[PDB]
Amino acid sequence: ASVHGTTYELLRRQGIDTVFGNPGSNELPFLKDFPEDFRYILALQEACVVGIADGYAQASRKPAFINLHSAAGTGNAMGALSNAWNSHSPLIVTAGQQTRAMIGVEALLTNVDAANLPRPLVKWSYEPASAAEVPHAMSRAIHMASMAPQGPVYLSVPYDDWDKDADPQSHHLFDRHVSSSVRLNDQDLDILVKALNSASNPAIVLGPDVDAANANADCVMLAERLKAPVWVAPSAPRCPFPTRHPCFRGLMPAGIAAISQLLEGHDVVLVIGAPVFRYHQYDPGQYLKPGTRLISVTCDPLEAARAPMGDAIVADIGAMASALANLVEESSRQLPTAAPEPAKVDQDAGRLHPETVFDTLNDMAPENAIYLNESTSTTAQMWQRLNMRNPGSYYFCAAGGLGFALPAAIGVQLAEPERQVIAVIGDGSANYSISALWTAAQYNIPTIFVIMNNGTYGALRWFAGVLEAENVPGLDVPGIDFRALAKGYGVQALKADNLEQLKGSLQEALSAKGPVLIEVSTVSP
Amino acid sequence: ASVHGTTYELLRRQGIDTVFGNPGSNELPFLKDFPEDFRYILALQEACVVGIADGYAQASRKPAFINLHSAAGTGNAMGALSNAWNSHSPLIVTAGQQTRAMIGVEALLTNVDAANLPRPLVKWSYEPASAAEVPHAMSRAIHMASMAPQGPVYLSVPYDDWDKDADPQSHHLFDRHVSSSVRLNDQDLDILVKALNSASNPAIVLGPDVDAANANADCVMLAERLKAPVWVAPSAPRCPFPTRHPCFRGLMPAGIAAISQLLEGHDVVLVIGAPVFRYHQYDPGQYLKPGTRLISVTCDPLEAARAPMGDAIVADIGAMASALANLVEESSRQLPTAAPEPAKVDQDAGRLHPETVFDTLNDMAPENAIYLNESTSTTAQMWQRLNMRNPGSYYFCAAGGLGFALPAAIGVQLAEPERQVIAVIGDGSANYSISALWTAAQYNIPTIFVIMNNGTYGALRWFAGVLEAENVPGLDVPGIDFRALAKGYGVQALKADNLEQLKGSLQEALSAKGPVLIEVSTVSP
Amino acid sequence: ASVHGTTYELLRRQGIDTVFGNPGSNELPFLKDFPEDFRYILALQEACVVGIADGYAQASRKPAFINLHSAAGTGNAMGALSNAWNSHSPLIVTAGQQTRAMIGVEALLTNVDAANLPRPLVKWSYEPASAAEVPHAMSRAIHMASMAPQGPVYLSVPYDDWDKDADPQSHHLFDRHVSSSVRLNDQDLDILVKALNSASNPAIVLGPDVDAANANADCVMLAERLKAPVWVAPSAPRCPFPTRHPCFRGLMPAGIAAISQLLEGHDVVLVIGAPVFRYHQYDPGQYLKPGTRLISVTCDPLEAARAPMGDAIVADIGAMASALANLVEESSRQLPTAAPEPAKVDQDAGRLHPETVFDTLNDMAPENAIYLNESTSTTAQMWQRLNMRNPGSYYFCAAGGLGFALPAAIGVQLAEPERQVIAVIGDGSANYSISALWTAAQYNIPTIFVIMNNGTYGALRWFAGVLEAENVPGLDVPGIDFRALAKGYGVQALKADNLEQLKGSLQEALSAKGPVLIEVSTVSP
Ligand SMILES: Cc1ncc(C[n+]2c([C@@H](O)/C=C/c3cccnc3)sc(CCOP(=O)(O)OP(=O)(O)O)c2C)c(N)n1
Ligand SMILES: Cc1ncc(C[n+]2c([C@@H](O)/C=C/c3cccnc3)sc(CCOP(=O)(O)OP(=O)(O)O)c2C)c(N)n1
Ligand SMILES: Cc1ncc(C[n+]2c([C@@H](O)/C=C/c3cccnc3)sc(CCOP(=O)(O)OP(=O)(O)O)c2C)c(N)n1
């Protein structure tokens, strides 16, 4: 067998059947004779290839396979990798290298010091020392991406390797099962359960690894038994809990003093599937107030090490959430009462308030919609206004890197063909991976893109206000016609300048048989 | 509180009370006002500082703290780190950096690009961005070294940081408990237990993470219930099983074809606490023969990813060994029969055969002795001839880096004051960290060093034979007087040129109140 | 031709005929059939292999070739590399890697992520992607080490590569000549010459790249024409000027305020072949006083970039010193007058003052002696008391990493068989690479080692005084018998407890036909 044949066999035996790619000449020997059972998803720029794969992985809860072109293709994707690192996305990134005979002279398209290029944003990064090693290296990549804590990995392959003879002993790679589905030993688990049972005012804080694990329903059982309020950890990249459940208390503010104040009076705070914590703004104070202690369950030793307070347990989030939900006592305390509905903001017949857009989306979208956020100044309102009952219903760029939601919405919709994906993207963010629109058009992946157009980088105007920073250049982005960009890439486009047109545009988009972009004229900050 | 005071408080609250060091000027601000409850162990060169700390950590089963001088001190220790990486040793390596005001100009003793210096041989490597951050960075280092898979970490600290004010919120670091004591979820554990119960001819292979976990006695229960032979995985850095137990079958040959041949006819091979596998020699063949399947339990995702065959489970070795030993059925098969005793090699009245040295050590040493091996051409004989009943009884440089056993024997004897440590070290290996002898003399740490003197790098002469390599230079090391080197560093010294003198020298050394070196005239290969 | 044959041919064609090494099993395929025209110099530990090669390179002014064993051998040498980096030493470091077929599984002796291991202390670090590439990679290593700014480089080679067929086109590597012998263009050179001619009170500061370039005699002509005082830049690793020439003013103090004060009243300060500057102690103040401007000529862009003041020119030191010495006008100012001789320190019949040792060395040593310093608390006195008329007469560990002078003295004496090498090494420093003594004994390289025994790390006691640091542990090193360590490794040994015995020991050592160690009882600080 050739290295090509053995590698595609390994991939299909490990569950991989799709290649997200932008091709190049170092990759033609890999892509030729492309197997009939695989499907290649082209995108026009690498940040878009990786963003699509990333949404697909996160929504499918399985690794996604990427193929990029040498150094420049890999480099074009590094902002996307920054997000994938922070979301623990299982991404297997492969890039073609020059033929081994041309690497020394550094011929054009040589990826110099290849394994160092994607660092520090990958779990494992490698170039094999011979062609026969490529299937074993690919095996290592699959498992490194897929073990807890999941994350992106990188394999560089000289293009001459593919046609070489494979090692016949590579067949032992094909059916390897590797598990990291582990939980705290019985004795220590019992100590943890007794501490939860004994708490007089417990709180729960949930992060994105809960949704990744599909542990959401176990965490609802846990919060119901403990009769405990549930917050989402700050800077949330996913939604880990039904947002209209009576226990739900919303997104935590990403500040040190805000969070200790929020948690005051809670004696035991249990954090599951989040870093402790992904703060953002400068908000100095106590990490925790007197009387509050914290216990974190994380799948990631780097999170456990860097928490400034609390105990920690490094284990699988699905296994831990399930064990705790089934072991804790039913508390005799009263179940928390549901937060009230948000108020309607006054809206005239002109530009839309973001509140109005979310309220209308919530009124019209199916109950199993999936939302993506890259509307940076409207996050708090989005979280208050969208009822998200099901898992896998929210994604926001986990490292803050814009250019995620537009491609990732396409990957998510590919992963979940029966759930309507709606990406709400600011006019600033929409440009970073605008070319991804073409993939949705070409493959007919029926994502709806809602572009919030207020003409400015609104969140940066807000941070500038907090800093009291005057005379900052580069904050305005006038003069973009999103309907013309959608036409550019083959996607039906609509404009909503007021509420009547927003309703009509949403009705048409929800009825459409393909992707749709709606440019919404929003109020300027 | 100062950063100095808060950092020593963090260390003592996390169980650390000893600093293994070779001091320098960037470290004086850390070492001044050295706390009365800590103890500083000086060694004269950094490979020796790290080798001592390493033996201490491995034998104590807890992290050890090291303090070295900037770049050159850290660089002198990098071979030692190579071993510590492969043995999963929990080493917290700190090094002093220049004052922050002098780093830019690259004053003398600046550690340039400090965090990259020890890579790839550390789990985590860092320099803090401010003085107030140093206690949190130290906390991160403690936990990264201590979480499974354990390993060395590196922290660089500008010398001006220590006298700065600490953040009052650093107190939340002091009592953090972080656990990685986890095992496979119940459902999958039950599947694994049923596969073991159902095996018709199971084999067990154990590696060094079993001894690190003190899981040895659980693995004896497991092998007794399964009525299964037990091998030690190849290239063994520790001994995970009593070597005269009836199930024990010895050290596996470090070759691919040798191991598949050994395992042939075994239907399920369970590997615990080892890489799969640490092969050495070139020995191409099948990874496993038809009819054999393998299941590995490892604490290290990098081991699980790179195994060329088998299933794998990434979990704590102590938690997994205990759970399996207590859950499996007692098989009705007959218990394996003990291997026979090794034969006596003919010995005349002249130079000693290595076989004779081990046989005599076994005759005379206490039953709780601890041995270290750095006699590279005699390993197989050592394993056959020393009855090691207890855990923590054997150490051999885990990456093959010579210069480990002499210092590590001193650390081990410090960790285990009531167990006689006996290091058997070839005349070649003895030179790499010869200066460590001074530490044993100065602190009166009563290690016995047995130097196997055959005048040559014997194992390299053997590998040269296997390669059929002629005219190789640099293989002979004549003209070293080990009794004079021991005198140099204050250690009592004895010579054994025949068996009568070997017996007398061992009797005197075993009776001594301090360290002793015995130079033994061994047969030339 | 094989890769082995083509590589040794490349080496001899590029002037390399000696391999400094400590062998291992990954290197046997390289070392077999060792060519009859090469010479292998064995040392017992890698810091000693690299220190010997380093002295040899620095004194010979040509690259030296090193061969080490995989990761642990390379790691044992990293402190030595830290020095070699700061001295711009042209060192070609090769290390053996596992066979390519065993790298993936990480067999024992695999050097993982090999090219990153020696960073940041090398100019270039690489592992070839195929066997046929090895001679080109070796060519790259030779030239990267040898081009200005010279420095260490690293090549990792899988052991199976050597017996493979070489590319017949590799012959084009054999006779490549690569020059970096360059100087500032004529127009800008003329501007610089006119500025020097016009200076009313010029000063010259010289660093180690002057001695490396053998530009010393040109700098004497330059200082004589400009009638300018000459200082050696701080933290000096080499001596660039005759120390009894009338222009010589000694070693600059390594502090910011000290140097600006020293230079005050000098209108133009010309620095040649040094960083600007290698400060050490904390000594805040003005980089330069009003009225002083600085112009640096360096062979190293990293030095030019990081100078906090002055203009800079990046060019070859030999070409620039020669051009300036021949172009500048003879000034009509009076030639500087020679510094007076140092005074005799009162010495009784007991322990030796360091002043007395240097005074006696200066009285007895040949006028072409070469000295090495690793007596850290006595540097200023050494510089005042040794008349060093010739180039290549002084070496001190350029990064401050102890363990350099003892091995490097052996390399220097190998490079300069007709110049008596005398290494003055403190009792603390002597331990770091003590095993190097064996190389001098085995090859009969007649270095004289003068061990300054005061029982303590004296310079650290001094820095502790400056810091006002009390209760510092680990500063004393009692209980070392250097005569016994020399006997250990086959080197004749003498003791001097007073001046009479110092004189007699020096007379005997200067008369000896092989290496000699003298342990000198010096006054305690
Ligand atoms: C790749 C990339 N480039 C730049 C940025 C900086 N940045 C961002 C940030 O540095 C801040 C990110 C942040 C931080 C905390 C919480 N949420 C977001 S926001 C932004 C403007 C986006 O404008 P738009 O999409 O029109 O939405 P709003 O009008 O609602 O704000 C910018 C430019 C970024 N985050 N990522
Ligand atoms: C830091 C370092 N430097 C070099 C080496 C290479 N090496 C070694 C290796 O490359 C091989 C290591 C090895 C490989 C597999 C199994 N066991 C050991 S062995 C050795 C000689 C040691 O001689 P000595 O202590 O006198 O014992 P024997 O006479 O019984 O053999 C050498 C030099 C090494 N392993 N580590
Ligand atoms: C590899 C290594 N390890 C540690 C150090 C730290 N250090 C040193 C330093 O951190 C300081 C180096 C320095 C700094 C500026 C100028 N000169 C030297 S000096 C030293 C003691 C050496 O003792 P000894 O040889 O007996 O001579 P003296 O009695 O005359 O001082 C030590 C230990 C070091 N420089 N290098």
Ligand SMILES: [Mg+2]
């Ligand atoms: Mg906007």
Ligand SMILES: [Mg+2]
């Ligand atoms: Mg030997």
Ligand SMILES: [Mg+2]
């Ligand atoms: Mg001293």
